[PDB]
């Protein structure tokens, strides 16, 4: 105790959105069903809520609009299972395809 | 550290969502950016049935510190209510809301909301917070109850 599972994900904070962060990244890639993504800022700022109707207005906005920058720390907690994950943000604009993100991983 | 607080707060929210008393509301307030604040909750306490407070949904705010759960949260009625143990600002004067007496870090947010609810119908004459509320209560008890019933129906959910 205590070594919480922690990964690093490269993406562009000005391109990817919260919905893409929710569906494509946290749920699809990291296998979550009802995740609660919190921004580790010492303020208890939660970006994504599992409860429908609460944070469905942030989906269209980009991550950068929430102060999310390079080296940001995100804590995703699944509501339907004891799954906590610390995701680090490595801001990279050069991806190629262009792809949305990449876990390093991998 | 806030890490201890936010971890404890995370347990509180998940436990509240899975199970909480009917009529009660407890949810982290929305930040201007659209996000929510775990250290700042918007709460709503239903009036107790069989009491003059019955029929009312009274709203308050919970403010947590980084010291939490070592320190109790600040409970603040918004708007302020007519009650002996409620300061004019809206702050609640309850025994379990002070770390120097009768406060345990193991106390759930639910237990606080249920505690404040009982304080509504059963005010403590020992620690008067509001001037006029303490006055009417210890004098014209009939007038006092009329003020409460009028206040409950005033804050009736609709
Ligand atoms: K929506």
Swiss-Prot record, chain A:
Modification after translation (UniProt): Sumoylated with SUMO1 and SUMO2/3 and by UBC9. Sumoylation at the C-terminal lysine cluster plays an essential role in nuclear trafficking.
Phenotype upon changing residue 40 to K: In ACCES; loss of function; does not rescue the abnormal phenotype in a zebrafish disease model
Modification Phosphoserine, positions: 64
Location in or out of the cell: Cytoplasm; Nucleus
Chain positions of cross-link Glycyl lysine isopeptide (Lys-Gly) (interchain with G-Cter in SUMO2): 97
Protein role: The heterodimer acts as an E1 ligase for SUMO1, SUMO2, SUMO3, and probably SUMO4. It mediates ATP-dependent activation of SUMO proteins followed by formation of a thioester bond between a SUMO protein and a conserved active site cysteine residue on UBA2/SAE2.
Disease involvement: ACCES syndrome: An autosomal dominant syndrome characterized by a highly variable phenotypic spectrum. Clinical features include aplasia cutis congenita, thin scalp hair, dry skin, dental anomalies, ectrodactyly, and skeletal and neurodevelopmental abnormalities. Craniofacial, cardiac, renal and genital anomalies have also been reported. Affected individuals have early growth deficiencies that improve with age.
Quaternary structure (record): Heterodimer of SAE1 and UBA2/SAE2. The heterodimer corresponds to the two domains that are encoded on a single polypeptide chain in ubiquitin-activating enzyme E1. Interacts with UBE2I.
Family note: Belongs to the ubiquitin-activating E1 family.
Protein known as: SUMO-activating enzyme subunit 2
Taxonomic lineage from the root: Eukaryota, Metazoa, Chordata, Craniata, Vertebrata
Curated annotation (Swiss-Prot), chain B:
Outcome, altering residue 27 to A: Impairs binding to RANBP2
Cross-link (Glycyl lysine isopeptide (Lys-Gly) (interchain with G-Cter in ubiquitin)): 18
SMART domains: UBCc (SM00212)
Residue ranges of domain UBC core in the record: 4-157
Effect of residue 85 to Q: Impairs catalytic activity
GO biological process annotation, one example: positive regulation of canonical NF-kappaB signal transduction
Pathway involvement of the protein, from the record: Protein modification; protein sumoylation
Outcome reported for the amino acid change (mutating residue 127 to S): No effect on catalytic activity
Site positions (Substrate binding): 100-101
Active site annotation, chain numbering: 93
Annotated spans, Interaction with SUMO1: 13-18
GO cellular component, one term: synaptonemal complex
Keywords on record: Acetylation, ATP-binding, Cell cycle, Cell division, Chromosome partition, Cytoplasm, Host-virus interaction, Isopeptide bond, Mitosis, Nucleotide-binding, Nucleus, Phosphoprotein, Transferase, Ubl conjugation, Ubl conjugation pathway
Site feature (Interaction with RANBP2) residues: 4, 25, 57
Effect the entry attributes to changing residue 57 to A: Impairs binding to RANBP2
In-chain residues carrying the UniProt-annotated modification Phosphoserine: 71
Pfam entry (one): UQ_con
Effect upon mutating residue 59 to A: Impairs binding to RANBP2
Protein role: Accepts the ubiquitin-like proteins SUMO1, SUMO2, SUMO3, SUMO4 and SUMO1P1/SUMO5 from the UBLE1A-UBLE1B E1 complex and catalyzes their covalent attachment to other proteins with the help of an E3 ligase such as RANBP2, CBX4 and ZNF451. Can catalyze the formation of poly-SUMO chains. Necessary for sumoylation of FOXL2 and KAT5. Essential for nuclear architecture and chromosome segregation. Sumoylates p53/TP53 at 'Lys-386'. Mediates sumoylation of ERCC6 which is essential for its transcription-coupled nucleotide excision repair activity.
Self-association and partners: Forms a complex with SENP6 and UBE2I in response to UV irradiation. Forms a tight complex with RANGAP1 and RANBP2. Identified in a complex with SUMO2 and UBE2I, where one ZNF451 interacts with one UBE2I and two SUMO2 chains, one bound to the UBE2I active site and the other to another region of the same UBE2I molecule. Interacts with SETX. Interacts with HIPK1 and HIPK2. Interacts with PPM1J. Interacts with RASD2. Interacts with TCF3. Interacts with NR2C1; the interaction promotes its sumoylation. Interacts with SIAH1. Interacts with PARP.
UniProt-recorded name of the protein: SUMO-conjugating enzyme UBC9
Organism listed in the record: Homo sapiens (Human)
UniProt lineage: Eukaryota, Metazoa, Chordata, Craniata, Vertebrata
Gene this chain is encoded by: UBE2I
């Amino acid at each position: 105790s205590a070594s919480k599972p922690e990964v690093t994900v490269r993406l562009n904070v000005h391109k990817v959105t919260v919905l893409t962060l929710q569906d494509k990244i946290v749920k699809e890639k990291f296998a979550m069903v009802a995740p609660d993504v919190q921004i580790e800022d010492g303020k208890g700022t939660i970006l994504i809520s599992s409860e429908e109707g609460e944070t469905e207005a942030n989906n269209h906005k980009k991550l950068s609009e929430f102060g999310i920058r390079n080296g940001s720390r995100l804590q995703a907690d699944d509501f339907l299972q004891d799954y906590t994950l610390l995701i680090n943000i490595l801001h990279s604009e050069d991806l190629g395809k262009d792809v949305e993100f990449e876990v390093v991983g991998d | 550290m806030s890490g201890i607080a936010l971890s404890r707060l995370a347990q509180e929210r998940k436990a509240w969502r899975k199970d909480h008393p009917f009529g009660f509301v407890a949810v982290p307030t929305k930040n201007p950016d659209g996000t929510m604040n775990l250290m700042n909750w918007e709460c709503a306490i239903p009036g107790k049935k069989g009491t003059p407070w019955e029929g009312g949904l009274f709203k308050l705010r919970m403010l947590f510190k980084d010291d939490y759960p070592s320190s109790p949260p600040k409970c603040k009625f918004e708007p302020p209510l007519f009650h002996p143990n409620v300061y004019p600002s809206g702050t609640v004067c309850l025994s379990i809301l002070e770390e120097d007496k009768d406060w345990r870090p193991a106390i759930t947010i639910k237990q606080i909301l249920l505690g404040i609810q009982e304080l509504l119908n059963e005010p403590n004459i020992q620690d008067p917070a509001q001037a006029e509320a303490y006055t009417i209560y210890c004098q014209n008890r009939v007038e006092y109850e009329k003020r409460v019933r009028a206040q409950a129906k005033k804050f009736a959910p609709s």
